[PDB]
mmCIF file of N, CA and C (backbone and C1' of nucleotides) in Angstrom:
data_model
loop_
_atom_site.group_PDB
_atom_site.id
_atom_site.type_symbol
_atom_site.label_atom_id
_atom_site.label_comp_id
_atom_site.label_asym_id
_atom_site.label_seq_id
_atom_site.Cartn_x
_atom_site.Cartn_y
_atom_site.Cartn_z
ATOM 1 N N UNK B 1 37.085 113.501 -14.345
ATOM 2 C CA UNK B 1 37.753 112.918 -15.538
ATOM 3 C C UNK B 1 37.064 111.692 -16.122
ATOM 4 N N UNK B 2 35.977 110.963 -15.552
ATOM 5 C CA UNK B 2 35.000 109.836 -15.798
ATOM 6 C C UNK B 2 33.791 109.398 -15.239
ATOM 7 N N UNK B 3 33.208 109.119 -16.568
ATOM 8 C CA UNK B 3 31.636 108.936 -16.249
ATOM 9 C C UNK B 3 31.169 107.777 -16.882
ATOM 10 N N UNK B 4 31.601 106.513 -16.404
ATOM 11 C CA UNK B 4 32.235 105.682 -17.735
ATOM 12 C C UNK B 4 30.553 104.823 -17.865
ATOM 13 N N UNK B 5 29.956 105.108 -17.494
ATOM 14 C CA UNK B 5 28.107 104.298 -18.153
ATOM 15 C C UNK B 5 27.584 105.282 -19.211
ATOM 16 N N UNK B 6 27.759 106.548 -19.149
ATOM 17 C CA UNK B 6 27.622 107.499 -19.950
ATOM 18 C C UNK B 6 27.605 107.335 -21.230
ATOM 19 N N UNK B 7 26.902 106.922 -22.078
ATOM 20 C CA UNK B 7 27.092 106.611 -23.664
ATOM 21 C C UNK B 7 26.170 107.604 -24.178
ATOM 22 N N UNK B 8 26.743 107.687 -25.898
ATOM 23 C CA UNK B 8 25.914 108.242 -26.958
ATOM 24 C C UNK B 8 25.430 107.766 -27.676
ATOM 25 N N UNK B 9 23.803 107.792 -28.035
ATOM 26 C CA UNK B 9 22.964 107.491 -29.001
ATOM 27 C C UNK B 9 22.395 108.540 -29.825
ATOM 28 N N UNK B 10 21.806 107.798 -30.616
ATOM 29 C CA UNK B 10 20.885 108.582 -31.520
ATOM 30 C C UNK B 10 19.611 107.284 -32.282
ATOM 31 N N UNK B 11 18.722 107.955 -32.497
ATOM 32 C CA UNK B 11 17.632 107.401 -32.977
ATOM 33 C C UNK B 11 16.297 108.482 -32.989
ATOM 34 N N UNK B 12 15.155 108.197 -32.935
ATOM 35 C CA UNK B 12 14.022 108.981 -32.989
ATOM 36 C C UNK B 12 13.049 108.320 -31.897
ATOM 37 N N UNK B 13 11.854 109.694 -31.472
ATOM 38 C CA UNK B 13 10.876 109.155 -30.586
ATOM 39 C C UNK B 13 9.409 108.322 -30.859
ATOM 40 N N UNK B 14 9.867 107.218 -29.728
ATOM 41 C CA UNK B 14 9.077 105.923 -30.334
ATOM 42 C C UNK B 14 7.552 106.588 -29.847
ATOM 43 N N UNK B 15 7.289 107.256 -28.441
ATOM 44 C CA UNK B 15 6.121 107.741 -28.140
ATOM 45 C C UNK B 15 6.333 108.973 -26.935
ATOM 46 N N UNK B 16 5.802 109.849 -27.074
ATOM 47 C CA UNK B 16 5.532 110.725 -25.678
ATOM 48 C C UNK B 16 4.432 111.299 -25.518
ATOM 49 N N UNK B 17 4.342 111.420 -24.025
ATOM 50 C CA UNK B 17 2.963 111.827 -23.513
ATOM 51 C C UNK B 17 3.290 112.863 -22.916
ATOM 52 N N UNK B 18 2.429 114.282 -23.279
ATOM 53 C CA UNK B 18 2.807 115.545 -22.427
ATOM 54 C C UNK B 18 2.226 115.247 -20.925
ATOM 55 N N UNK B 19 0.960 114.491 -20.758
ATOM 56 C CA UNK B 19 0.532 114.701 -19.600
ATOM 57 C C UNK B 19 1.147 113.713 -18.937
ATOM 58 N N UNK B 20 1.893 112.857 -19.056
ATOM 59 C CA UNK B 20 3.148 112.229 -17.820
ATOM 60 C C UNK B 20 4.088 112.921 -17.959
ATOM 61 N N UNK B 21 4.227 113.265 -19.119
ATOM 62 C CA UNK B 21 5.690 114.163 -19.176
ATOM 63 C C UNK B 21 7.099 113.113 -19.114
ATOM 64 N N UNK B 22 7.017 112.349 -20.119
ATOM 65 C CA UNK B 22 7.697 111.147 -20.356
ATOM 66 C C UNK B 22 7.367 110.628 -22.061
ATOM 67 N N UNK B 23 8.442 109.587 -22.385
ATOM 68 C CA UNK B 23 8.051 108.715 -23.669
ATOM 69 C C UNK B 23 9.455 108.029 -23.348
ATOM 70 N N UNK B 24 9.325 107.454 -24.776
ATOM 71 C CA UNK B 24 10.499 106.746 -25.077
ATOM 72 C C UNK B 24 10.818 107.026 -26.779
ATOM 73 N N UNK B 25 12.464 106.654 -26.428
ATOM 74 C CA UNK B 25 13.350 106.805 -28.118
ATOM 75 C C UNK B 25 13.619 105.508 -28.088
ATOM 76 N N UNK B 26 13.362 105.399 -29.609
ATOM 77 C CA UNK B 26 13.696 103.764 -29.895
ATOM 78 C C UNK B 26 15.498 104.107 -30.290
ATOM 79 N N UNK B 27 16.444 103.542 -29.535
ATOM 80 C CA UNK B 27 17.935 103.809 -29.880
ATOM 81 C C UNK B 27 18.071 103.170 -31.603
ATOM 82 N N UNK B 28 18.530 103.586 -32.283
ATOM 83 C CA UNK B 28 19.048 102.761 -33.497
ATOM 84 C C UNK B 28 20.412 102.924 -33.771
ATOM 85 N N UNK B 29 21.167 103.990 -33.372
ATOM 86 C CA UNK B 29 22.521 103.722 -33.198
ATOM 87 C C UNK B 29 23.399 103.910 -31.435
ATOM 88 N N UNK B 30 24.210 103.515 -31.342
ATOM 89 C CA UNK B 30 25.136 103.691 -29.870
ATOM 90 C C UNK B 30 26.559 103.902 -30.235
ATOM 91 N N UNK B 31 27.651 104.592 -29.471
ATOM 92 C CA UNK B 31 28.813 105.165 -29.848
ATOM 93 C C UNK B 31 29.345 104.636 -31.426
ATOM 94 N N UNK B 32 28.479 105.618 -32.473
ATOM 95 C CA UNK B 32 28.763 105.590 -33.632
ATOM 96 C C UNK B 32 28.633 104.324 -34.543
ATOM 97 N N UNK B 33 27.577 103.188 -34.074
ATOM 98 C CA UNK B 33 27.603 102.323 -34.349
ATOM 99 C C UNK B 33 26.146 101.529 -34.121
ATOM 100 N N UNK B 34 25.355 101.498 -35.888
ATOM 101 C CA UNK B 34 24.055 101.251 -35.901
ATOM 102 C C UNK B 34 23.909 99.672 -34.822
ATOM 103 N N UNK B 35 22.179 100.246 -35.056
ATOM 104 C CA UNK B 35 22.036 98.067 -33.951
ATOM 105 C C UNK B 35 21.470 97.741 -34.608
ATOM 106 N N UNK B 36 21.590 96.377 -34.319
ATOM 107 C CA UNK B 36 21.112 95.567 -35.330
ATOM 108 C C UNK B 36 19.578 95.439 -34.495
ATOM 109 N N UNK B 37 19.486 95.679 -33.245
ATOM 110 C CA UNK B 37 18.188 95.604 -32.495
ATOM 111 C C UNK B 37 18.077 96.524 -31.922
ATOM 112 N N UNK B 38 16.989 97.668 -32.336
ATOM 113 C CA UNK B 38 16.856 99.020 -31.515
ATOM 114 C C UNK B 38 16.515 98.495 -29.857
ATOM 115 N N UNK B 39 16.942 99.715 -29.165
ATOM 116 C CA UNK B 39 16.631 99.298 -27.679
ATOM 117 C C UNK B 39 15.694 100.798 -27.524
ATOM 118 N N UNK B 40 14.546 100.532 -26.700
ATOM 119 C CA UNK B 40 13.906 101.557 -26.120
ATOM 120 C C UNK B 40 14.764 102.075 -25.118
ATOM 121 N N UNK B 41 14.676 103.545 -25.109
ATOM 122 C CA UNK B 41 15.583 104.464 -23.490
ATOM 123 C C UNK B 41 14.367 105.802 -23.462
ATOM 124 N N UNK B 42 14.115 105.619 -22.247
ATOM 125 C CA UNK B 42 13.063 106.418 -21.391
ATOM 126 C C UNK B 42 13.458 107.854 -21.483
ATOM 127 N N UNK B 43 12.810 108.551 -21.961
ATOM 128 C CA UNK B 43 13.218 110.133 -21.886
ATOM 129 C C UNK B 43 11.909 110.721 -21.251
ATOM 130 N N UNK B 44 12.829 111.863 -20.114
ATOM 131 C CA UNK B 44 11.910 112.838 -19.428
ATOM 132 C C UNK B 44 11.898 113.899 -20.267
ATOM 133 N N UNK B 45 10.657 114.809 -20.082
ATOM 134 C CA UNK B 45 10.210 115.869 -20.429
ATOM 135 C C UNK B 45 11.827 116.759 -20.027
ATOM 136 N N UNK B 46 11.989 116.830 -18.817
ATOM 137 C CA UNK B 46 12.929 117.571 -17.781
ATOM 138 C C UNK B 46 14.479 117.633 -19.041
ATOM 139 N N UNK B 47 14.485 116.702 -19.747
ATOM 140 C CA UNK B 47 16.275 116.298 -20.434
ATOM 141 C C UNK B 47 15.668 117.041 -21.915
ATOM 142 N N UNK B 48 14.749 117.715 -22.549
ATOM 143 C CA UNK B 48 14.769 117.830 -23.728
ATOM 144 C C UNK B 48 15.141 119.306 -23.700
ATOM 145 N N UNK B 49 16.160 119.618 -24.608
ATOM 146 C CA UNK B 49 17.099 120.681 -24.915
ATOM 147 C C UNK B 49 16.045 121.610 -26.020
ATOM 148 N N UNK B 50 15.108 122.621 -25.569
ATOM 149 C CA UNK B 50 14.708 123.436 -26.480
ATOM 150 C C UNK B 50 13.664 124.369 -25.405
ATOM 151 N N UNK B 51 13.167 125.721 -25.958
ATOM 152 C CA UNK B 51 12.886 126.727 -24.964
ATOM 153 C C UNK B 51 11.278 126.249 -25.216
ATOM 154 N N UNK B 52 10.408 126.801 -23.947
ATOM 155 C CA UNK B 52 9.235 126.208 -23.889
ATOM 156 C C UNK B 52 8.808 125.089 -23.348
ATOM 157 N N UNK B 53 7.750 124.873 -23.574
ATOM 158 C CA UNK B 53 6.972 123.697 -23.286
ATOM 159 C C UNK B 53 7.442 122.823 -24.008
ATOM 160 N N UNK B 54 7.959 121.352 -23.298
ATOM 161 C CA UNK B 54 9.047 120.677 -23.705
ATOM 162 C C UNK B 54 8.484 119.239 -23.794
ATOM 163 N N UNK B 55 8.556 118.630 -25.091
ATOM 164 C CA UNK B 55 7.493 117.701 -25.799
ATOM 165 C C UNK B 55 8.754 117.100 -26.689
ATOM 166 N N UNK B 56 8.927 115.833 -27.322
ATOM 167 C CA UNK B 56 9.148 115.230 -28.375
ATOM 168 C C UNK B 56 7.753 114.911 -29.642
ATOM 169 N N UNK B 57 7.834 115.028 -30.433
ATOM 170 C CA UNK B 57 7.163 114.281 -31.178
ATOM 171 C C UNK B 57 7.112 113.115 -31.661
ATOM 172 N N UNK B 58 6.176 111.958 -32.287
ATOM 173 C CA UNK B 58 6.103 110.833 -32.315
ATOM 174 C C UNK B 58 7.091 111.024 -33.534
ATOM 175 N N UNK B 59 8.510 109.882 -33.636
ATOM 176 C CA UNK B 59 9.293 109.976 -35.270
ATOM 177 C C UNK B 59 10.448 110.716 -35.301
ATOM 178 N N UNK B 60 10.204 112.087 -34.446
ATOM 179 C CA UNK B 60 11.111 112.963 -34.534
ATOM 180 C C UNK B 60 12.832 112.627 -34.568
ATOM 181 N N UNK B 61 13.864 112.591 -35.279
ATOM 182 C CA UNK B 61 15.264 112.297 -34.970
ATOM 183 C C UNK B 61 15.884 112.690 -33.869
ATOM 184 N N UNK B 62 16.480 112.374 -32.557
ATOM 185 C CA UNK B 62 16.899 112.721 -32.203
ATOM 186 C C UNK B 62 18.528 112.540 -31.430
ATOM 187 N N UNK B 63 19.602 112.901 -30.814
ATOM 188 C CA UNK B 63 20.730 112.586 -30.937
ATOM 189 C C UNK B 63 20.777 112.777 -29.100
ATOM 190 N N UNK B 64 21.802 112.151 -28.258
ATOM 191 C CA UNK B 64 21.585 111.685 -27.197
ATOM 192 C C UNK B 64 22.736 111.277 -26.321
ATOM 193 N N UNK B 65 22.791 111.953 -24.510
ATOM 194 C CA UNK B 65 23.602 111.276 -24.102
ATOM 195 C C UNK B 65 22.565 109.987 -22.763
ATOM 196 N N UNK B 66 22.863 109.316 -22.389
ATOM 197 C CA UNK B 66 22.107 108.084 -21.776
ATOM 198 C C UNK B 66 23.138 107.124 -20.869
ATOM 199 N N UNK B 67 22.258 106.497 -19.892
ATOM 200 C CA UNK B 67 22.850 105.618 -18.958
ATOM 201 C C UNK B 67 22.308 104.658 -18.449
ATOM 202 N N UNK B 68 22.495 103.467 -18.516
ATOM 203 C CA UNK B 68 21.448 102.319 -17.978
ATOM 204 C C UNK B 68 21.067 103.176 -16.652
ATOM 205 N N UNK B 69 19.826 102.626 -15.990
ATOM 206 C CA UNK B 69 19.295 103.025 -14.884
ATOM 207 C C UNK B 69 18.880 101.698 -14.380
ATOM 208 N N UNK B 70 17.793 102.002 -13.045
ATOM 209 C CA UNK B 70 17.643 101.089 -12.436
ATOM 210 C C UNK B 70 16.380 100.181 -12.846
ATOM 211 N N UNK B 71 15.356 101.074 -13.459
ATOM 212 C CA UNK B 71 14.069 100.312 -14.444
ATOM 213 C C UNK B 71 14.296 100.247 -16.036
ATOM 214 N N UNK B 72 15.516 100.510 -16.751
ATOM 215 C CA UNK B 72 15.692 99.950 -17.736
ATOM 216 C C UNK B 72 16.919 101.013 -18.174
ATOM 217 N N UNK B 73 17.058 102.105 -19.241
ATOM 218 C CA UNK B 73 17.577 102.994 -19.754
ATOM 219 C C UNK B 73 17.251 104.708 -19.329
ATOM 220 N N UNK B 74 17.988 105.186 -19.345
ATOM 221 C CA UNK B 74 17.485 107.104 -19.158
ATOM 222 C C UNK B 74 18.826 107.759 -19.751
ATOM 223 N N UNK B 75 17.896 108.648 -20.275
ATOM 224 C CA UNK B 75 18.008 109.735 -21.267
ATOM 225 C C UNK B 75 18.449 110.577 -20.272
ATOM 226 N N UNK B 76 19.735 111.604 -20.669
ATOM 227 C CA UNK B 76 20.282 112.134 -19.652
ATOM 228 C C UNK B 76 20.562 113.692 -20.277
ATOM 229 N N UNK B 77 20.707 114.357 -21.792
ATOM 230 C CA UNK B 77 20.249 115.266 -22.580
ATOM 231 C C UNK B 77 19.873 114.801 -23.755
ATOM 232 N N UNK B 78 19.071 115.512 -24.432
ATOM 233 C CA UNK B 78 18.330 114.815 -25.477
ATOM 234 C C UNK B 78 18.179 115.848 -26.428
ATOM 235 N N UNK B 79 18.486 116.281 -27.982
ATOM 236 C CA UNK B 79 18.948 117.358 -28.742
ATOM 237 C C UNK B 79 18.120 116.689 -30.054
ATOM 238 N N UNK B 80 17.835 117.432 -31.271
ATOM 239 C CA UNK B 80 17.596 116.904 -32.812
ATOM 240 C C UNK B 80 19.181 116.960 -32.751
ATOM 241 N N UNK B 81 18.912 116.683 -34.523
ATOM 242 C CA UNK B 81 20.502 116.192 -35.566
ATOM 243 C C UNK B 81 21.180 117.575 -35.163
ATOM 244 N N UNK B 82 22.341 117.111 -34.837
ATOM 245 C CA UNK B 82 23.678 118.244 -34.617
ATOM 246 C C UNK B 82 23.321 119.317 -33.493
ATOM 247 N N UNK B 83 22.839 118.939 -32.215
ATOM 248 C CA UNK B 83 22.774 119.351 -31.248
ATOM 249 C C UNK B 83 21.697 120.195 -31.362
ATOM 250 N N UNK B 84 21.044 120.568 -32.738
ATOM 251 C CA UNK B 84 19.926 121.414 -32.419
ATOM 252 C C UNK B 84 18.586 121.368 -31.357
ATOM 253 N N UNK B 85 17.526 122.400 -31.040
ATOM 254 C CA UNK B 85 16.811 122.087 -30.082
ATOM 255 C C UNK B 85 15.969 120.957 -30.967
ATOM 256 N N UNK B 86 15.292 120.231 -30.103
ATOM 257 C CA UNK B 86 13.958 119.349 -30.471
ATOM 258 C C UNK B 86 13.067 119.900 -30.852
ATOM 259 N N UNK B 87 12.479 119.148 -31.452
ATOM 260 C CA UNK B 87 11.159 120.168 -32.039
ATOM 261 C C UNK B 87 9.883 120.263 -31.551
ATOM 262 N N UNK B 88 9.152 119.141 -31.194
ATOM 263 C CA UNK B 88 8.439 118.657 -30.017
ATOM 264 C C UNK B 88 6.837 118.713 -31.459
ATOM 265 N N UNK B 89 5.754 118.994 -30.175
ATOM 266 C CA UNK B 89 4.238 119.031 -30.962
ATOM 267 C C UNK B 89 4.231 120.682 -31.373
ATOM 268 O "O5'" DT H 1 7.156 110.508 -12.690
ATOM 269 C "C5'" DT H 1 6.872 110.031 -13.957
ATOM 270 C "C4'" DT H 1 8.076 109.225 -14.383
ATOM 271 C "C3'" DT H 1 8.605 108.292 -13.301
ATOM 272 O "O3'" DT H 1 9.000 107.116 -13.956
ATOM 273 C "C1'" DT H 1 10.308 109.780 -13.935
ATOM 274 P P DT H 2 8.458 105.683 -13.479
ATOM 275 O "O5'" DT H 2 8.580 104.778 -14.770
ATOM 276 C "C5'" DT H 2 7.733 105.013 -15.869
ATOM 277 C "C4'" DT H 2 8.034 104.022 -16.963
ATOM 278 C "C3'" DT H 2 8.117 102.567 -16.502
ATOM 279 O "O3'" DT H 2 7.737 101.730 -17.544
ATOM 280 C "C1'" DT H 2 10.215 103.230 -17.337
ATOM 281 P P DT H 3 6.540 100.663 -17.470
ATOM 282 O "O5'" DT H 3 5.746 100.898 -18.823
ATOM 283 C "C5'" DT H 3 4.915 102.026 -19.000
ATOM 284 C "C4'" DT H 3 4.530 102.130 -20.440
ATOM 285 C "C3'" DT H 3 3.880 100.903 -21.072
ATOM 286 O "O3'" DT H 3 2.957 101.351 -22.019
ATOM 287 C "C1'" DT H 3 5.866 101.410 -22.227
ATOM 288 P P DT H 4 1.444 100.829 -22.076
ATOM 289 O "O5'" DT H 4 1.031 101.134 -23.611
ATOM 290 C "C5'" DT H 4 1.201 100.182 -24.691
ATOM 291 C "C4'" DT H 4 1.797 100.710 -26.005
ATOM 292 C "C3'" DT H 4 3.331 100.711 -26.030
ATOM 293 O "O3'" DT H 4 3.873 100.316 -27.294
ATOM 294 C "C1'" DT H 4 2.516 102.930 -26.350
#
DNA sequence: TTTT
């Protein structure tokens, strides 16, 4: 019934690298509510919602559930606008 | 599997 660190963002990807198989999304909004200071949150290859070889692109929009972690932020599923898959390279 |  609770998962209470669990929040939703959305923003786009600030950088990813296929060969770590990692980047980061710069956050620009959190539960429905723009920032006034984007925060970087770490996204794995492993959390991106689309079939294939699984990549963000640099810019790309994307929409988000996330949880502080222990080296900063993580990305926990990671979707484009309205749950669609990501689009990647 | 935490910086670009």
């Amino acid at each position: 019934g609770s998962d209470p660190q669990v929040l939703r963002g959305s923003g786009h990807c600030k950088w990813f690298n296929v060969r770590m198989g990692f980047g980061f999304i710069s956050m620009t909004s959190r539960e429905g509510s723009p920032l006034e200071n984007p925060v970087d949150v770490f996204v794995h290859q492993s959390k991106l919602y689309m079939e294939g070889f699984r990549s963000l692109k640099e810019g790309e929009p994307v929409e988000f559930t996330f949880k502080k972690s222990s080296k900063g932020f993580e990305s926990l599923r990671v979707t484009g606008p309205g749950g669609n898959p990501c689009l990647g390279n």
